[PDB]
C-alpha cells in the first residue's frame, strides 16, 4: 500500500499508493515496497510534487481532453500560495510533473507561468526586445526607427 519515489539525488520518499497514482507514469509502472527511479528531479522538487499530491488526494480535475474546462480552470488558492517559489524551481516543478505525467500539476503549475508572461509591464517588454536575436540589426534599426516618434 506504499510506493517509493527515488529522486535524482538518491533520497527515498515513501508515498501512499492511492495518493501516488496521481502520476500516470507510476500508476502504469505498478502493472509489474515498489521502488522506482525519478532520475532528473531533485529531492526538494519531488517533495513539493508529493505534497501537492497529498493535498489533491480527493480533488476532481478535468478529463485531460477538455476545450474550456482545462484552459479556463482557475488555480486553487493552495495552488497559488503553493507556487510562490523561485522561478527556476517552479520550472523544475513543471519538469517533474511532465516526467511523472501529472497533468493537473502540469496544469496548475503552468497557468502561473502563463499569468507571468502576460500581466507584465510594457516598459520591460520594450526593454526585453532582442535578448534572443530573432531580428537582423537592419530590422532592429527599422523597428526602433518606426516607433521613435513616441519617445
Amino acid at each position: 500500500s506504499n510506493v517509493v519515489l527515488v529522486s535524482g539525488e538518491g533520497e527515498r520518499f515513501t508515498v501512499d499508493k492511492k495518493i501516488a497514482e496521481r502520476s500516470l507514469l507510476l500508476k502504469n509502472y505498478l502493472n509489474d515496497e515498489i521502488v522506482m527511479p525519478v532520475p532528473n528531479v531533485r529531492s526538494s522538487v519531488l517533495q513539493k510534487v508529493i505534497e501537492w499530491a497529498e493535498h489533491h488526494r480527493d480533488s476532481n480535475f478535468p478529463d485531460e481532453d477538455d476545450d474550456d474546462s482545462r484552459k479556463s480552470a482557475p488555480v486553487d488558492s493552495w495552488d497559488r500560495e503553493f507556487l510562490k517559489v523561485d522561478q527556476e524551481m517552479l520550472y523544475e516543478i513543471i519538469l517533474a510533473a511532465n516526467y511523472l505525467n501529472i497533468k493537473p500539476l502540469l496544469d496548475a503549475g503552468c497557468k502561473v507561468v502563463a499569468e507571468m508572461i502576460r500581466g507584465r509591464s510594457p516598459e520591460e517588454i520594450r526593454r526585453t526586445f532582442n535578448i534572443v536575436n530573432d531580428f537582423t540589426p537592419e530590422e532592429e534599426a527599422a523597428i526602433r526607427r518606426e516607433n521613435e516618434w513616441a519617445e
Binding site: 500508476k27 502493472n31 536575436n133
Partner: protein, 579 residues
Amino acid sequence: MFNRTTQLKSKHPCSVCTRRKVKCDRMIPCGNCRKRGQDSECMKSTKLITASSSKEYLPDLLLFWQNYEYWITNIGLYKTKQRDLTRTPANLDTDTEECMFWMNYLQKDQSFQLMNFAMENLGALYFGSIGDISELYLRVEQYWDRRADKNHSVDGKYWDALIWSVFTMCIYYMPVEKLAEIFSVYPLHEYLGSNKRLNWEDGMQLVMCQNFARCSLFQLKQCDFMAHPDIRLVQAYLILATTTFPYDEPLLANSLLTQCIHTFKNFHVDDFRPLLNDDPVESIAKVTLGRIFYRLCGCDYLQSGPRKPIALHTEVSSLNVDVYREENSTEVLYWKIISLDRDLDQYLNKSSKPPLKTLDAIRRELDIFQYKVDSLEEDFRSNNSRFQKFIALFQISTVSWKLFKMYLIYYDTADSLLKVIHYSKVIISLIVNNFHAKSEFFNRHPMVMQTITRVVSFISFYQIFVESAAVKQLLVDLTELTANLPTIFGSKLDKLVYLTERLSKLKLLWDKVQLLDSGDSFYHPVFKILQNDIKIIELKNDEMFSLIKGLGSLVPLNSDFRTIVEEFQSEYNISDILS
C-alpha cells in the same frame, strides 16, 4: 550520418550568407561560414561566442538511426532471405517422406496433451483465430478417426492442417520440462541422424516446431488450397504466425499472407457489425470473421516490407480508410495497439519528421490503452488471462518506447532520453518477471524478439556516441537479458547477439580514430560503416538481380579512412545476419 547541426539555431539566415546570396546552414555560427573560417564574423549579433560544448553530429545521427533501424533490425535481420535458385533443391519427393515421419511421430494422447496445454495456457493466441478450442477437440477426434483412411475430402484436410498448426503453436510455446514428459527424443534422433546428446533445450524443440509447421503447410498443399479458398487457411496461418515461422520462412509467409488476403477479401464482407436482416448463424459468422480480420491485420502489418507489396491494413487510429471504430473492443485492442505502432514506424524509411500533434495524440491513446488494459478481468484460475495481460502490456510498453524514442530523435523534448531508459527498464522488468516458474514461456512470443531487437540496437547505437552511466547500466542489463532470452528463437537470437557485438566493436572503433571536422559536416570511419550497412542490405533486398537471372541466360555485369572501413567490414561483416 554527418552534418554540423549544433544546439541554439539562429532564427534568420546570417548576414554573410545574405551578402553572398547562397543557402544558409542556419546554425550558430553556421556550417557555411565555419567552413571558410569566418567564425568570429558571424557570432557578433548578441551575447556572442556562446559555448557549443556539445557533440554536434548527434541530431543528424539519430535521424540516421531512424533509417538504420528500418534497414537492419526490421528488414535485414528478419525479413531478408538470400536465396540462389540455382543451388536450392526442389522436389516433392522430399516432403512426402519427411512430413510423413512427423505425422506418424505424433501419437494420439500426445496430441491431446498438446491440446490441453493450448486450452490451459495459450488462450490469448488461438481465440482470435479459431475461437473456443472445445469445438476443436472434436476435430482432433475426427483426425484420429480419419487417420487410417485413403480418400480424404478437402474439408477434412483443412481441419487437419488447422490442428497441425495448433500443434505447432503448442510445440513452440511448451516449456522443456512439460515437453520432455510428453515426447521421447531418441526415435527422432534415429530419423534425423545427429548427435545423441542434443536434448530439447539444446535446440531440438525448434526443429520439431519447424517441421510441424512444414507438416501443416504440407496438409494445406494436400488441400490444394489455391483452388479452394477457405477461412480455415486464414485460421491456420494466423495460428502459424504466433511462432517464428514468419522469420524462418519470411518469403513463404508473405505468399501465404497474400493468399490469406485473397481468401479473406473473397468473402466481400467489409462491415462485421451484424445487421438486422441476418440469419442468427450469419451474425455469429460475421463476428468471428471480424475477429479474424483484425488478427489478420496485426499479422499483416508485422510482415510489412519490400518483399510484401499487397497489404490489408487500410484504417487509421488517429486524426480513404474503411473499417475502423465500428467494432467492439475485445480483440481490436491488439490491433488498436499495433495501428498505434504503425503510425510511429511509418516514419522510419520516410524522410520527413512526424508532426508533434500526432505524437501527442499517440501519447493520449497510450494513456487510454494503459487504463483499458488495467480494466481487464483477472481470472486467477486461468493461466491465459495473465498471458493476454502480458501481451497487451508488452505491446503498450513497446509503443511507449518507440514514441519516446521518436521524441528523442526528431524533437529532443523534456527528458525523452530518460523516458527511453524508463520504458526500456519497463520492457526488461516485464521480461525478467517471466523468469519465474509457470510463466517462462511468455518470453517466446515474437513481439519480444522484435522489441528486444529494437531496444538493444538503439541502446548499443546510443552507447557508441554518448558516454553516459544510466545508458551503460541499461546496456549491461539488456546484454544479460539477451543472454537470457529463450533458445527457441535460435539463429535470430545469435544474430542479435552478433549485431550487439558489432555495435560494441564499433564503439571501440569510435574511441580510437579521431573525428575529422570539416566545418559543415564530420567524418569518421564509424559513420561510413553505418552508411554502408544500409547500402549492403538494400542491395540484398533489390530483386533486379533475381529478375535478370530469371529472364534467361542474362548475367549482371555489376584515403586513410578507407583502410579502416574495409578492415572492419572484412572483420565484422553486416551480411552475417542474413544466412
